[PDB]
């Protein structure tokens, strides 16, 4: 993680859908992972309390540490979530608060999707934990994160482990990127309400008529760079004005169009260390269907994993590997 | 059309590719069209002269008028080109200049793809034409257009029907959008040279340390709206910093990543009349392989058509119909 | 009041200066006012309670209601301060909290300048009051306000009457505009660290050399509009980069040059109700000299009033009227 | 000379005024200068060819070379003019065109002001010279310039010595800054017609209500940097929306308010060499009164020089020195 943008939408088909880009410097080993009922999830890597998950879920994540680490995903009850980067804001304890279990920041999604249904259930879950400053071994250190969840009803919350403790925002707009805090970007929105689909009227200066070059002038002032605040604005504004999806397939299509204003080609963002920071995959999930969808930097063809198609009582993780090959369809040889 | 964005790139394997978005109000009947050798292209709708075309080509177009109308394409000799909108600038005669033939703006691509090989041939063919104000029955007027072309060698030109005549730009940057003229955007680039992939350094204000929120701060000042001028900067600047493509396939993918910065969702742009202006399709073509590739608003899976696999002496247009259903690969039962 | 911008600075010779624009709809009856010691200042306009002020002070203000309303000023002990618009963010109570007395928002500056020396005195002072939702016979309701103070030593604080309580900000950057909160703008600074005095480097695209139009390109990204957020960034950044003032006169000059980036001409900003919102005056204060300096929309020559020049035990307010005529010096017979 | 912004305006009083900031990297010796009729101004600094000037004029300039060099000014018949930097575009000849004299770029304002009445006179005068690459100025290469003139009637033109020859633009908006060329900025204006005094309408994202911070949001998309193109846009847009000046004083006041959005404080712009580029003075001039007005980086009080006050058949240049000291009026001891 060194970036992601995320949003949810609601179709006129009464379906809730959630999507996120994931931006990074090289693709570690990641796949679509289905975690079955009762598989059990660690709280901490350095202690063996395993929490038993009532619910099966499907998500993108990693199988490299003790328990599956999910980056986003949706569960068998329609709860959807993601963990996103929160640099220079995320604050974690050394010690669990009186009467909470310690939890590794990288296990939050996995634990939440494994046992929650509603955003309230999540709020209640989280305040029984303390996010702890424990390293991990796929990345080396404790990554600064925040979290977004959307339940089948389409309510979104954002959970943010700030300096002063866990900040929680109820019924958000359904947009989240990276730092700063949710209330900062929400406030930022008010600066940009003049950003619309509609052209400004022509004007005159003295004798001179002034008309726009073509279309899109309504959007003047929207920023084009790939910072988190600019990313937030674009995803929010394009989410407000892009037409309602009529069904789940359109929902995925629209989700990836909105996200495309924030998709990063290899080379256009370099980190301090000269590492190239780019959009590795783009994912979408639907609460009602429990389908999970993803396309990759190298393959814009969308793939799909249906959670309910599997044996939710399986002994073992079920996984699907990435196909990083552009899946071009040949219309003649 | 209402808008579009285009660019060309060169792979490290000596291929040239060109790609464009097509932005429009609603989608008329468009498909991919192979025009065979010797098929014939009309110059004008109101006159019946049909110019025999030497070359076969493939691209995106309409078959609603007398001769196939091509929006972009590549021909059997590796000439690539496109017509894009040029609102407020395009200017057409009522009548041909002495010793030129009249040509409808919407036939320029089909004529040129059918009869030219190199950037210079394009220039030469054009001085034998005069663009006329002739309408057509898909649109009802002559749409204001300008044109771009890229040959096998990777040279790009822009051709602009201006108030004072055809302006030609030789050896361009390989980017073209819509109005204003090409010199204006080229100059406009200079205002944004500080937009780079690299982050700026922390500063202090008094006691206060100031650091960026994440990455991407290098690009501060780039505009994010979908006007022609902002599209031009985005495609030009992201053409500059995007990693060189190593082969044809990666060239296609790179092209659509770059064009993603300027892909318009349905609803985000509306015309003075409240019609939504959105990216209907996105296409790419390679001069060396003569493959055409495209994906749709409703389908992000790339399709490909190979000009040279067909019979270039066919009697009839060979055409491939859009598939408007999101082509999702089921990894288990869905 | 519908807006203003403020900053403080420090000179080479150890002097602290504070400056503000005032932006408004109408030019109201406003003057420089010297309040002597022991004049007595109401706390609440609908009540008869008066705190007897220990300190004399000078700033711009109104004599419309029972006690002088100061919009900014410096006192004889070197405390500087100002009230500014805090729209959509200022929250007041109907009744005082246990142990405090109510105070009207437009009395804050008067009370504080009348009774405080350091920013810490200001913080202490304030915990014995609760800002009340009390209106006035000048604007017809309690204006949404926030406050800034800078003491002799150059330390600045912001105080913000938020929904959740009074928010103090200690050791600030010494810039304040309007909404939103100081924490938001402080955070917003980080998005703009790439705005510098330094040109970006030339680049190429293909064969094309690209170089700035002139000077100034290191500022790409700074916004030019008159929103509070945009004005904060212009005042903060131009505060960072504009040279240190060597003495008091240069401080005033520099402060007004910086403020000039946020001066509003008549007509460029209109309210919802179609009222013109423009900068009526600009003032600076100096902690060490206790001079007050000001200029007006129609008068660009700066005036000064010296607090320490007057009898500080006067019975009566001392006041100086605005000279609203452009004060042009004729160098020969004009 | 290193940058400048200019505009002209027309009062309801039926008066025409013109104004300009001047940017530069230190204080040069510059005064306001009244050139009497029949004084004599060279064309070329390296030939002693004198042109007798029919008219008298006042403006800001330098006496450091043989004939006075004026940066701007107004003559006794109501012609106002200025020269402004035009870097990377200004192109001049080595040799005059058959039938023309060589003129130094730096002498254009002085020659014109001393011999022309109308903007048509300027267009005509100019076809009898070729601008030349004369170094010195013992400042030494001829600086890259373009020119604006506005006559008593309120018409403005721009003259640009381009690669393809001299370009004239007639009936301009009466805004000019620096590079690029005039039609490039005129076209640029079109991208910003959405910049208005009027606030945008509040909107909703879901349940969340969004309203501006304060006032001024109509301006979103106006850049606040000091590049020539940003300056061009701030002058033109604030020229368009600033209230009409109702008399000559208001005109001067209004011009300095508009120019104040482009006034450069010392330290905020540095050159590729790390010199500081700042606004040394701002001036205005009225075609009908023939008054010259000016204020300084260090002196916000406006001074005025009246052309018609002097003896216009004077033998000698009449001169006023800058007063570089903040002219603060003391209202008490």
UniProtKB/Swiss-Prot annotation, chains A, D:
What does the UniProt record report as the effect of altering residue 63 to S in this chain? Slightly improves the specific activity. Has little impact on the substrate affinity, but exhibits 12.3-fold increase in catalytic efficiency
UniProt entry tagged with the keyword Mitochondrion: no
Modified after translation how? Processing exposes a catalytic N-terminal nucleophile residue with a free alpha amino group.
Subunit-level organization: Homotetramer.
Q: How is activity regulated here?
A: Hydrolase activity is rapidly inhibited by lysine modifying reagents.
Q: What is its EC number?
A: 3.5.1.11
The record's comment on protein family reads: Belongs to the peptidase C59 family.
Q: What is this protein called?
A: Penicillin V acylase
Citing just one GO molecular function, the answer is: penicillin amidase activity
**Keywords assigned by UniProt, alphabetized:** Antibiotic resistance, Hydrolase, Zymogen
Q: What InterPro entries does the annotation carry?
A: CBAH/NAAA_C (IPR029132), Ntn_hydrolases_N (IPR029055), Peptidase_C59 (IPR052193)
Q: Which GO terms describe its biological process?
A: response to antibiotic
Q: What class of enzyme is it?
A: hydrolase
Reactions this protein catalyses: a penicillin + H2O = 6-aminopenicillanate + a carboxylate
Swiss-Prot record, chains B, C:
| Reactions mediated catalytically | a penicillin + H2O = 6-aminopenicillanate + a carboxylate
Regarding how it is modified after translation, the entry says: Processing exposes a catalytic N-terminal nucleophile residue with a free alpha amino group.
pH effect on activity, per entry: Optimum pH is 6.0. Is very stable at pH 6.0-7.0.
Q: What's the reported outcome of changing residue 198 to Y?
A: Slightly improves the specific activity. Has little impact on the substrate affinity, but exhibits 12.3-fold increase in catalytic efficiency
Q: Which Gene3D superfamilies match?
A: Penicillin V Acylase, Chain A
Family annotation (Pfam families): CBAH
Q: Which residues form the active site?
A: 4 (nucleophile)
Q: Which domain of life is it from?
A: Bacteria
One GO MF term on file is: penicillin amidase activity
Q: Give the regulation of activity.
A: Hydrolase activity is rapidly inhibited by lysine modifying reagents.
Is the Transmembrane helix keyword given for this protein? no
Q: What EC number(s) has UniProt assigned to this enzyme?
A: 3.5.1.11
What InterPro entries is this protein classified in? CBAH/NAAA_C, Ntn_hydrolases_N, Peptidase_C59
The similarity comment for this entry is: Belongs to the peptidase C59 family.
Query: Whom does it interact with, and what assembly results?
Result: Homotetramer.
Query: Function of this protein?
Result: Catalyzes the hydrolysis of penicillin V to 6-aminopenicillanate (6-APA). Exhibits high specificity for penicillin V. Penicillin G and other related compounds are hydrolyzed at less than 10% of the rate of penicillin V. Among the cephalosporins, cephalosporin C is resistant to cleavage, whereas cephalosporin G is cleaved at about 1% of the rate of cleavage of penicillin V.
Q: What is this protein called?
A: Penicillin V acylase
Organism this protein belongs to: Lysinibacillus sphaericus (Bacillus sphaericus)
């Amino acid at each position: 993680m060194l970036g992601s943008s995320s949003l949810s939408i609601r179709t006129t088909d009464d379906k809730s859908l959630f999507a996120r880009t994931m931006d990074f410097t090289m693709e570690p080993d990641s796949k679509v992972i289905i975690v079955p009922r009762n598989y059990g999830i660690r709280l901490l890597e350095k202690e063996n309390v395993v929490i038993n998950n009532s619910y099966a879920f499907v998500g993108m994540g990693s199988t490299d540490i003790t328990s599956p680490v999910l980056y986003d995903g949706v569960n068998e009850k329609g709860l959807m979530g993601a963990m996103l980067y929160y640099a220079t804001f995320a604050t974690y304890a050394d010690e669990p608060k009186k009467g909470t279990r310690g939890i590794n920041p990288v296990y939050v999604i996995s634990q939440v999707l494994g046992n929650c249904v509603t955003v309230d259930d999540v709020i209640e879950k989280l305040t029984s934990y303390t996010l702890l400053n424990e390293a991990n071994i796929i990345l080396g250190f404790a990554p600064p994160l925040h979290y977004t969840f959307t339940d089948a009803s389409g309510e979104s919350i954002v959970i943010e482990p700030d300096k002063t403790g866990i900040t929680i925002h109820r019924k958000t707009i359904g947009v989240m990127t990276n730092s700063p805090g949710y209330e900062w970007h929400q406030t930022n929105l008010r600066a940009y309400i003049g950003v619309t689909p509609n052209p400004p009227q022509d004007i005159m200066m003295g004798d001179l008529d002034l008309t726009p070059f073509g279309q899109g002038a309504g959007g003047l002032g929207l920023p084009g760079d790939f910072t988190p605040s600019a990313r937030f604005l674009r995803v929010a504004y394009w989410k407000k004005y892009t037409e309602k999806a009529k069904n789940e397939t359109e929902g995925v299509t629209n989700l990836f169009h909105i996200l495309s204003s924030v998709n990063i080609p290899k080379g256009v963002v370099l980190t301090n260390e000269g590492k190239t920071d780019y959009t590795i995959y783009t994912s979408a999930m639907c609460a009602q269907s429990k389908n999970y969808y993803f396309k990759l930097y190298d393959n814009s063809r969308i793939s799909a994993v249906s959670l309910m198609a599997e044996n939710l009582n399986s002994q073992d993780l079920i996984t699907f590997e990435w196909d990083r090959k552009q899946d071009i369809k040949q219309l003649n040889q």
